[PDB]
Amino acid sequence: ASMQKLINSVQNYAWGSKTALTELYGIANPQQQPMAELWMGAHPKSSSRITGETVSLRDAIEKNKTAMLGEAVANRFGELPFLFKVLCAAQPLSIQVHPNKRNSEIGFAKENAAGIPMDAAERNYKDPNHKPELVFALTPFLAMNAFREFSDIVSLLQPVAGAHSAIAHFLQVPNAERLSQLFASLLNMQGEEKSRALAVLKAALNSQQGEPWQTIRVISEYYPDDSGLFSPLLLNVVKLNPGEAMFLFAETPHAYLQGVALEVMANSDNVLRAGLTPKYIDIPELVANVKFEPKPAGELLTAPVKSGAELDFPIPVDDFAFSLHDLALQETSIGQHSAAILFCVEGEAVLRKDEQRLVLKPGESAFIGADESPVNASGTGRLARVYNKL
Numbered sequence: 001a002s003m004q005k006l007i008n009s010v011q012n013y014a015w016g017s018k019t020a021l022t023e024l025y026g027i028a029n030p031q032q033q034p035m036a037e038l039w040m041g042a043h044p045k046s047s048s049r050i051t052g053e054t055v056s057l058r059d060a061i062e063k064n065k066t067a068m069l070g071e072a073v074a075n076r077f078g079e080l081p082f083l084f085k086v087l088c089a090a091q092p093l094s095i096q097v098h099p100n101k102r103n104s105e106i107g108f109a110k111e112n113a114a115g116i117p118m119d120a121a122e123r124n125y126k127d128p129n130h131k132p133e134l135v136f137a138l139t140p141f142l143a144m145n146a147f148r149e150f151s152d153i154v155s156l157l158q159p160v161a162g163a164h165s166a167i168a169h170f171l172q173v174p175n176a177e178r179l180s181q182l183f184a185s186l187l188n189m190q191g192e193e194k195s196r197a198l199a200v201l202k203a204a205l206n207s208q209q210g211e212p213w214q215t216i217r218v219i220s221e222y223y224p225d226d227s228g229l230f231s232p233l234l235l236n237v238v239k240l241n242p243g244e245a246m247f248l249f250a251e252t253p254h255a256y257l258q259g260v261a262l263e264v265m266a267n268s269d270n271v272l273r274a275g276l277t278p279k280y281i282d283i284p285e286l287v288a289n290v291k292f293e294p295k296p297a298g299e300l301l302t303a304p305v306k307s308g309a310e311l312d313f314p315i316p317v318d319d320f321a322f323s324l325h326d327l328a329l330q331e332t333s334i335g336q337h338s339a340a341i342l343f344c345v346e347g348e349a350v351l352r353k354d355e356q357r358l359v360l361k362p363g364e365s366a367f368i369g370a371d372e373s374p375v376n377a378s379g380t381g382r383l384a385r386v387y388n389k390l
């Protein structure tokens with residue numbers, strides 16, 4: 001078929017919502033398992049499938065790379081260069097940093113030389129490149145992203161100046177070097193040093209109102225003994241309205257705290273943890289991979305561009321592109337020179353290719369091979385597309 005309706009994997013990670021995908025999309029969950037991620041793509045660990053027998057989308061692409069992916073993508077990447085997820089964060093998730101291109105090459109090589117299997121838990125670097133990443137809110141979405149302006153951090157730390165000398169040290173000279181030292185010191189707190197700092201913070205949670213104190217309170221219910229409880233004082237806390245997006249830069253701490261979002265990423269990721277985790281953190285390595293530069297709140301959301309019915313979220317990389325398409329009862333053409341995945345965000349989409357018609361209800365998606373572009377879309381609501389602009 002010109003258009004293939006996707007059968008998609010749901011990862012039942014412990015932190016997933018037992019209800020979100022069901023409430024939003026009618027996805028069946030009689031056993032009430034947590035449903036953390038809905039995967040749309042051709043990841044080797046759990047590829048989407050297409051149908052008349054059921055086959056792996058990854059296997060299908062592999063047998064016909066130029067036709068399915070297009071020449072550009074078959075040339076540059078040799079596979080589907082993106083994985084498209086719905087993320088349902090029912091609990092706050094760990095603070096993460098993605099290393100830059102240079103350090104990714106190094107860490108990938110270190111782990112390869114040490115013989116760490118690629119799918120081992122210990123494995124942090126799975127790509128010799130820095131892989132860019134876009135998050136797009138489906139429901140209101142609470143997250144952290146990047147360091148706040150220094151004067152903001154100063155105001156926020158004053159109520160907890162006594163928690164640790166590193167905090168006092170930073171307040172004395174609020175610069176990048178001392179921000180770095182503060183971040184390392186907080187992460188390295190041990191025993192009674194750590195418990196003292198946490199007791200100061202929790203006392204502050206009784207006499208401070210509103211954000212980011214409220215976010216700290218929320219996080220403390222899941223990570224009551226974590227030095228990452230200080231992080232909303234250092235990192236921008238953001239509440240994305242549905243339809244807003246952020247592009248996560250290298251060397252920049254971020255965390256997803258609550259809500260449902262679409263995420264576009266490469267198949268293989270590099271991740272260093274920076275708090276909100278029971279796992280070991282190599283602090284020197286983390287610190288060597290973080291850029292201690294503020295990012296102003298006005299710069300956090302990616303600014304999309306509307307042209308006709310299309311809203312593009314321009315991304316500073318070749319690997320993938322992301323757009324939203326307003327559906328109308330009159331057809332519009334959606335074309336690209338690559339493979340595309342189309343996902344019904346809301347309303348209902350009818351896709352047409354010549355004589356073939358395919359209906360997607362919210363939460364459903366289709367794969368369109370490069371050879372099959374363009375398709376005509378009509379209906380109501382919005383269709384999200386991941387594809388490649390090359």
Ligand SMILES: [Y+2]
Pocket residue numbers: 133263265
């Ligand atoms: Y991610």
Ligand SMILES: [Zn+2]
Pocket residue numbers: 096098133248254
């Ligand atoms: Zn990330």
